[PDB]
Ligand binder design. Structure first.
Ligand SMILES: [Cl-]
Ligand SMILES: [Cl-]
Ligand SMILES: [Cl-]
Ligand SMILES: [Cl-]
Ligand SMILES: [Cl-]
Ligand SMILES: [Cl-]
Ligand SMILES: [K+]
Ligand SMILES: [Mg+2]
Ligand SMILES: [Mg+2]
Ligand SMILES: [Mg+2]
Ligand SMILES: [Mg+2]
Ligand SMILES: [Mg+2]
Ligand SMILES: [Mg+2]
Ligand SMILES: [Mg+2]
Ligand SMILES: [Mg+2]
Ligand SMILES: [Mg+2]
Ligand SMILES: [Mg+2]
Ligand SMILES: [Mg+2]
Ligand code: NA
Ligand code: NA
Ligand code: NA
Ligand code: NA
Ligand code: NA
Ligand code: NA
Ligand code: NA
Ligand code: NA
Ligand code: NA
Ligand code: NA
Ligand code: NA
Ligand code: NA
Ligand code: NA
Ligand code: NA
Ligand code: NA
Lengths: 172, 142, 337, 132, 160
RNA sequence: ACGCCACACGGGGUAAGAGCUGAACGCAUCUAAGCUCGAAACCCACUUGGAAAAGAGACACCGCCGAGGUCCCGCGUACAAG
RNA sequence: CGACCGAGUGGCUUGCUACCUCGAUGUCGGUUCCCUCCAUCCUGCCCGUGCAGAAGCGGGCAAGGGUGAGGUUGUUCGCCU
RNA sequence: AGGUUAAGGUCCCCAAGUGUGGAUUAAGUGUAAUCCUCUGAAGGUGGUCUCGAGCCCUAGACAGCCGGGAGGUGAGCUUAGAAGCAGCUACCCUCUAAGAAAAGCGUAACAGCUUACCGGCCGAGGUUUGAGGCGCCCAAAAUGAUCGGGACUCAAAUCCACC
């Protein structure tokens, strides 16, 4: 099989070895696409993903590579954006961006501040009780968002009653 | 230092056992062999089970002793000893006339033996000697 | 149903054999933080006394109050860094590259060493900087020796040689720092490295006790009750099960106890001084009179009186430093009574 | 528990007979267990100053006898060390009967007490005649 | 006791009641189920349960699997639904047990079992095209309670 | 000893598990490739031994008609002989 | 929580067998001292709940460490504090 | 004493192939004829490969996204109330390219959210079922793991042929 992806005018993609770099107005993203007998190349105006094998496992990965590359075309032009909301019941939770990480204080009345380091070139912008994660690398931005929601994880008590925390509101 | 090697082999990206078998073959034939770039040799398979075997070999032991090397120097030299009758005269000589190296202490580039190479483009399930050594707790001195 | 019980003694300090070097040899060094500097000093054990201190601990319900604390007295006269040895990074660990010596040597250094009569402090230094340029330089350590002659209570005049590491700022800066200390004459004191109130790791070769049995050596029980009267008083029950048909090295047996190397962590330095304020009436038992450069260490220290003990800045401190503790009293009462 | 503010060499064991320093009606008490303690194989469980122990009444009024009650150790013959080095020891071994909330069961204490016992059981100490 | 003790055919046929006394009664309540007054040819579909290995099935197993299959057909079709299942086997082989050591070891009578050769149909149900999926499920439960592996086979039914 | 002193934190990789991106299968999907985390457990950290590691090691100096050493003598920080 | 019926793993109990030893492989229980297994009692980290919380109940990973003192009885076992 | 085979074997240890045409397997499965000795079961598997049958499709199939999803009437009955949806019975005609006397949630009952059914965008195979191959789950034990060992993955495994 062979699938051909036409790269936008806005974008510019260059490849070295198994690594692919995609640069655009919103930034650049380099990934590593490695899988037995699948060839990724740049043919001037298009990206080519081809293989001599046609089995279920090869076909699975070929399709995966496509969606990864299309997401890279998007990140460099439009960019990716996840929006979150902070919600609390009794104790006033404090969410802030300190350094290259996001810190959360007074969660459920805690004394110890909960925190997490931001992934790569992701930009977290807070506005009152609303948050917005964004960047070109969908992998990086995606994790960063999820890590914020995972940060208010509670296992000891009933989640149905103790619903405090930041939650993913809008997914791109 | 200074090994007067008749042959210098490049183990980089080559299947360990297949290389080892040929080195043993030649050493018994009275050849002086130097395996180079051992940290970059390779062994195919699912990494989780490969390491489980090597870590198990480290735990084994008693007062009598079961010394098992953690660095790619030894792992390779031990693999080769396993293909040589090292407890005999002819076999000890052959074994002692073979040495493995981390990186390349020579000027020449080692030759690649037929059948021993692995195509990274065709395979994804394999591991590097150096990667096993790090999991074993060795000191990355390369 | 035979109750459970932890084994007798630890398998981490063996084999329990006589120490090779009476002079201890640190196998770990502090991290390169602040400015460059030598990471250790040495002295000779003298004896013990007690002192009265004001509670330093800010978290103690008694802070600011009087408190009696036991102290081991150690004479810490100046030593001499006679050389600068450099190591190189190779695929087989670190290896000694070259050394840089001096001309000014102690009058009795020749009781142990074959003192250098012809040397080249430049070629060596050059080789070190060339290697550093190559990015193959390992670490930097000074060869140091003590001056037993300064301590009258000690019979030996023949110095004790030891290699102490130097760490600090950049490799380049501490390389230079080292070279300076050496060239002078190598003279340095406890002040230059430690401050009163810091935590240190004291190493030493313990008091030898020759051959001893399992009860003492490993802390096993004595035979109890009726068993104690049959012919066995201080012997363990069995040397092992039927199978494996061999005696396992883990079973407690007789042998050499003491005269081993131990490194005791987090020893607090109470006071670094000079003179005879800490000396005891009638003299320290089996040692003598103290009057000069000394150090007061909290608690005990491995080894007998006169033995060489080594200092190193604590590699794993549990607490923060509380400098210069207020000492209100140093007992001078006789140790005979 | 809260720190005693002194070192203690436990002078009592499981089975020891001591003095009940109060007016509950009990005269002699026998130690049965020590609260919060867990020793090692073959070791006879130990108690000392400032410890809370489980006890049985050996002597006293007909009603108090054979009763299994809790108590607090107030005095002991084995020496203890104060923060200034000084050792302190008593004339006998004694404990005071106490309830669930650590309040003395009796109305009055008989004899002296260690100042250290106040840092743990204030309501017992706040009934002391002499605190040494 | 375990079926491991009687599942294989490793003894001669022991069915002559004229020489065997004290044989326990069968636990098999009924062999003809559903609507016994109606005919087998009066149904569009006919599915049988085929045994894959040659074995011995004790009356205890026959009752348990027959029960748990018909109980399903009664639950999904009713106590008087339109169907009729058939347990086409009867337990003829008598079983012993040596319950002294190996001296005078001939065992005493403890039970009965039906011998089924691989490829034979143990059960055979008859129903309309609608109830075809219920009979399959009823049989699924049935082969869960007998030793061998089984093939649920639809004989007359091309309405799949 | 019944007395007194000292005995981490932190990293790296995982299990169960929680997730991200993601296809076979336009959707969905924690997984098939890839990734972020995550156990008193694993590896490092720390302590102890360790040139007989047969690839039997490295550096500096003194010396090869003399450096150094054993014996001898007075003694123990050592010790059953050694 | 879980009957019936069906399929298994272990080799601690018990039974069967009579291969090894009758020119002897010293008994039970206990004690002392050493190593191990996991089918986990506690401790770490997890999942579900008839999970508000607090106290539980059930389940997963996990063998680093721990699992103690006494009264009757030779007891192993087991009953009791 | 010379020569050729048998069982068995030809990557090394170890004599002889890292032999040829082709296919499967990713578990180190396996590299274990027979066996006290080499285990692995009922039951389960959109792991992957090969094969057959039925039906749907460029007059646009399967899926996804958007739009529509209507009134007669909130059928009648039961009932204070029931209006698709408590229960009982019925289950009709209009509009139109579709739209149930309503399949599943939801309300105290309404509402509210979708299913059926029509249209659009899109554009290539889709869907149902039968059979076979290799593997995976099921799968816990005591001093140190194992196919004799090393180690092996388009094999040095497995099956069909061959030199
Ligand atoms: Cl070993
Ligand atoms: Cl051999
Ligand atoms: Cl692969
Ligand atoms: Cl004893
Ligand atoms: Cl107790
Ligand atoms: Cl393997
Ligand atoms: K016998
Ligand atoms: Mg709770
Ligand atoms: Mg006797
Ligand atoms: Mg004295
Ligand atoms: Mg005195
Ligand atoms: Mg006992
Ligand atoms: Mg014997
Ligand atoms: Mg388990
Ligand atoms: Mg253990
Ligand atoms: Mg050959
Ligand atoms: Mg296997
Ligand atoms: Mg077989
Ligand atoms: Na391999
Ligand atoms: Na080992
Ligand atoms: Na005797
Ligand atoms: Na005696
Ligand atoms: Na014996
Ligand atoms: Na008989
Ligand atoms: Na079955
Ligand atoms: Na960890
Ligand atoms: Na040597
Ligand atoms: Na069994
Ligand atoms: Na005999
Ligand atoms: Na015994
Ligand atoms: Na454990
Ligand atoms: Na008992
Ligand atoms: Na294997």
């Amino acid at each position: 099989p062979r699938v051909e992806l036409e790269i936008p005018e806005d974008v510019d993609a260059e490849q070295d070895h198994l690594d692919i770099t995609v640069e655009g107005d919103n930034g650049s993203v380099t990934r590593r696409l490695w899988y037995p007998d699948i060839d990724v190349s740049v043919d001037g105006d298009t990206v080519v993903i081809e293989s001599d094998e046609d089995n279920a496992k090869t076909m699975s990965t070929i399709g995966t590579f496509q969606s990864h590359i299309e997401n890279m075309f998007h990140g460099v032009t439009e960019g990716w954006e996840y929006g979150m909301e902070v919600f609390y019941s009794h104790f006033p939770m404090q969410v802030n961006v300190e350094g290259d990480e996001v810190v959360i204080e007074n969660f459920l009345g805690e004394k110890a501040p909960r925190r997490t380091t931001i992934h790569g070139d992701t930009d977290v912008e807070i506005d009152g009780e609303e948050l917005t994660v964004s960047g070109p690398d969908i992998e990086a931005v995606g994790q960063t968002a999820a890590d914020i929601e995972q940060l208010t994880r509670i296992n000891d008590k009933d989640v149905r009653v103790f619903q405090d925390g930041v939650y993913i509101t809008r997914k791109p | 230092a200074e090994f007067d090697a008749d042959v210098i082999v490049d183990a980089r990206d080559c299947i360990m056992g297949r290389v080892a078998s040929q080195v043993a073959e030649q050493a018994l034939d009275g050849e002086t062999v130097a395996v180079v770039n051992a940290e970059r040799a390779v062994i195919t398979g699912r990494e989780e089970q490969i390491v489980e075997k090597y870590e198990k070999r480290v735990d084994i032991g008693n007062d009598n002793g079961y010394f098992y090397p953690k660095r790619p120097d030894g792992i390779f030299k031990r693999t080769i000893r396993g293909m040589l009758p090292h407890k005999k005269q002819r076999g000890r000589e052959a074994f002692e006339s073979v040495r493995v190296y981390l990186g390349n202490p020579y000027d020449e580039d080692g030759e690649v033996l037929d059948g021993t190479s692995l195509d990274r483009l065709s395979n994804i399930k394999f591991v590097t000697l150096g990667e096993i050594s790090e999991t074993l707790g060795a000191n990355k001195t390369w | 149903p035979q109750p459970s019980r932890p084994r007798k003694g630890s398998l981490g300090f063996g084999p329990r054999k006589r120490s090779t070097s009476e002079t201890p040899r640190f196998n770990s060094w502090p991290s390169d933080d602040g400015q460059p500097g030598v990471q250790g000093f040495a002295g000779y054990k003298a004896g013990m006394t007690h002192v009265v201190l004001v509670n330093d601990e800010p978290n103690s319900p008694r802070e600011g109050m009087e408190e009696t604390v036991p102290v081991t007295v150690i004479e810490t006269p100046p030593m001499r860094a006679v050389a600068l040895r450099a190591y190189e990074d190779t695929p087989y660990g670190q290896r000694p590259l070259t050394e840089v010596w001096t001309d000014e040597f102690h009058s009795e250094l020749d009781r142990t060493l074959d003192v250098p009569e012809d040397h080249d402090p430049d070629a060596a230094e050059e080789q070190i900087r060339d290697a550093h340029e190559a990015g193959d330089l390992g670490d930097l350590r000074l060869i140091t020796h003590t001056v037993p002659d300064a301590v009258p209570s000690v019979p030996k005049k023949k110095p004790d040689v030891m290699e102490t590491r130097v760490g600090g700022g950049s490799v380049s800066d501490r390389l230079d720092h080292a070279l300076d200390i050496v060239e002078d004459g190598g003279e340095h004191a406890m002040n230059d490295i430690f401050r009163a109130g810091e935590y240190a790791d004291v190493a030493g070769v313990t008091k030898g006790k020759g051959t001893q049995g399992p009860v003492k050596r490993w802390g096993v029980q004595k035979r109890k009750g009726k068993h104690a009267r049959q012919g066995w008083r201080r012997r363990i029950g069995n040397l092992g099960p039927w199978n494996p048909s061999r005696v396992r090295s883990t079973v407690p047996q007789q042998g050499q106890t003491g005269y081993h190397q131990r490194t005791e962590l987090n020893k607090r330095l109470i006071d670094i001084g000079e003179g005879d304020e800490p000396t005891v009436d009638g003299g320290f038992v089996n040692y003598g009179e103290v009057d000069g450069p000394y150090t007061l260490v909290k608690g005990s220290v491995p080894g007998p009186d006169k033995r060489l003990v080594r200092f190193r800045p604590a590699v794993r401190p549990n607490d923060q430093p509380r400098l210069d503790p207020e000492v209100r009293y140093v007992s001078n009462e006789s140790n005979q009574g | 528990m809260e720190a005693l503010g002194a070192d203690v060499t436990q002078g009592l064991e499981k089975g020891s007979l001591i003095t009940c320093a109060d007016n509950t009606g009990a005269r002699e008490l026998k130690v049965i267990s020590v609260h919060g303690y867990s020793g090692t194989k073959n070791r006879l469980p130990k108690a000392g100053l400032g410890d809370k122990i489980t006890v049985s009444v050996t002597k006293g009024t007909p009603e108090m006898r054979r009763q299994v009650l809790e108590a607090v150790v107030v005095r002991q013959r084995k020496p203890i060390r104060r923060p200034d080095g000084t050792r302190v020891k008593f004339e006998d071994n004694a404990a005071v009967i106490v309830d669930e909330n650590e309040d003395p069961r009796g109305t009055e204490l008989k004899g002296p007490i260690a100042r250290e016992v106040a840092q743990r059981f204030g309501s017992v100490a706040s009934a002391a005649t002499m605190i040494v | 006791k375990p079926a491991s003790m009687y599942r294989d055919i490793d003894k001669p046929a022991y069915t002559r009641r004229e020489y065997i006394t004290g044989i326990p009664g069968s636990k098999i309540a009924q062999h003809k189920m559903g609507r016994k007054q109606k005919d087998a040819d009066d149904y569009p579909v006919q599915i049988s349960l085929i045994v894959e290995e040659t074995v011995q099935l004790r009356h205890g197993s026959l009752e348990a699997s027959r029960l748990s299959a018909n109980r399903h057909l009664i639950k999904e079709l009713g106590e008087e639904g339109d169907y009729k299942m058939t347990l086409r086997k009867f337990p003829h082989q008598v079983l012993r047990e040596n319950k002294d050591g190996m001296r005078a070891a001939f065992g005493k009578i403890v039970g009965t079992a039906a011998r089924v050769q691989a490829g034979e149909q143990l059960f055979t149900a008859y129903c309309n095209v609608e109830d075809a999926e219920h009979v399959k499920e009823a049989f699924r439960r049935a082969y869960n309670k007998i030793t061998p592996s089984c093939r649920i086979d639809s004989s007359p039914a091309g309405n799949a």
